[PDB]
Amino acid sequence: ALNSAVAAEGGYLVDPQTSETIRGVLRSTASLRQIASVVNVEATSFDVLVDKTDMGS
Amino acid sequence: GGYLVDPQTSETIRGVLRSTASLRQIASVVNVEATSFDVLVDKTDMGSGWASETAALSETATPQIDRITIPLHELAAMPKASQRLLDDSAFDIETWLANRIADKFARAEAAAFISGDGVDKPTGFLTKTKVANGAWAWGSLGYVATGAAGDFAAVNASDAVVDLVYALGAEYRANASFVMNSKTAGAVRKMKDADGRFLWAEPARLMGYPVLIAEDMPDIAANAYAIAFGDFGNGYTIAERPDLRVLRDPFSAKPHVLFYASKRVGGDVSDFAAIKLLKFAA
Amino acid sequence: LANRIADKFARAEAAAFISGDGVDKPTGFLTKTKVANGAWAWGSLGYVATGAAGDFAAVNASDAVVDLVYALGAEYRANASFVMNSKTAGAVRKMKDADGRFLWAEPARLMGYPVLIAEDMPDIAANAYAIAFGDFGNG
Amino acid sequence: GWASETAALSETATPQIDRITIPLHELAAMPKASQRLLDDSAFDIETW
Amino acid sequence: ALNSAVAAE
Amino acid sequence: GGYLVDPQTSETIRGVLRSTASLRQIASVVNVEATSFDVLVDKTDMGS
């Protein structure tokens, strides 16, 4: 019941409260995914079909 | 009949209005009703595979976890107020002091959150075993240096600030803040081109990024860390109780009231990469 | 862990989307048979060059960036993005006029166009492709 | 304070209070307007 | 504040 | 992960046990109110 500084005089009653959420170092989430063309695909591959030339008028 | 005019006093007792810029509105304020606070951060990270079709995938790493314990100190101030004053001074002195003691506390712990040392008070980030950036360890804050001693760089000035920015990590720079005292921010603003025009153009943002004008960091000295920068939303953790518990003391000072009030607060650095500093040595 | 493994994956494939090679992982656009712009073929990406080797152009600096913009096609420049690592973007920002004032003025947009600070492209080397630009919505 | 665990916390200062008295003077101006003008000059001279 | 004797407190 | 685990504190505080029987239950317990209780005992016999 004495001071909270030294352990023997009731310093073992203070039981430090931990975090609510385990934090972490926060690394770069800049991944080009938010600027590229994200396509859902449930397959083995994906096949874009682009046009390398054009018509004439 | 000059004794009939009885000058009307104020409605509200005013006061000098001191700097409320306390880093509390930019740091990570955490409610805690305990003796301490324990952040649990991750100093490393995992590894990824790109496993082949026939690989029989093996083990990978796992982020080892580093605890920092917040001390969560107490802070008290104790004015001595006379009982005769508190009964005859129709301005409400009790709520005036509690409105004024709180403004001292939010002004006292601004030194604790930034330039506080270890004992009995939170360590601000300035006293956290500074390491020059590039050899960045975990248990230490990074800094870049300027070059010349008592000023910014001489030949190419204003480049010690921009690399301080671009060494803070691309994720941390998303919501960061400069921290200076108000007499260094003049010496930054006084920098000018070869033409005599000063080059940097309420929030007093600098290079777009917000600037918290603190009042605790040293100025441009020989080896001072005058300019701070980083993401204080992850870098610094403030732990506190959200009240200002007042105990009036009618008994010790017998003709006095002796307000004893104490809110208790703690907090030190949380993410060592989320703050970079500026040394002026070399 | 599932909140942390996902943050590694979105950090691991950022190297795949940009500097990934062919085997077992996506090829980012850096390893796609670079061709100098003007002789632009189909199965290859264009590039412009700077001039001097380990830095930007010496006499007229900052003109290797603006022609990189105006060789991207008028339709693609409508919603494009610069891509650099965070240590090159300093060396871009450190460029200055003859007066000592640095010339380029959250999104950290450059010449108005948005900039995605990646963390995978090389810095200013002898023959590195340090600065990327274009319409990644179609590219 | 930043009082230690075993400190027996002592007194502290208290903001001494300074009064400034506003004098609250009066200010007057007195134009002289003719009664003949105020009755025949349909612009409302009083509120003007 | 302090005493009611001297004004400035 | 050793920081991620924390012990249970307890259900309550315990203590070493002490002796209870204290001569209070065998002696004469007299409820008194003034500052002092006075017994009046005669020192010697009648001596007839």
Residue numbers in the entry:
A (entry chain A): 89 to 145
B (entry chain A): 98 to 298, 305 to 385
C (entry chain A): 194 to 298, 305 to 338
D (entry chain A): 146 to 193
E (entry chain C): 89 to 97
F (entry chain C): 98 to 145
Question: What does the report in the manuscript say about this coordinate set?
Answer:
Gene transfer agents (GTAs) are DNA-containing phage-like particles produced by some species of bacteria and archaea. The genes encoding proteins that form Rhodobacter capsulatus GTA particles (RcGTA) are derived from phage DNA, which has been integrated into the bacterial genome. Here, we use cryo-electron microscopy (cryo-EM) to determine the structures of RcGTA before and after DNA ejection, and to visualize the interactions of RcGTA with R. capsulatus cells. Particles of RcGTA have heads with a diameter of 38-nm and 49-nm long tails.
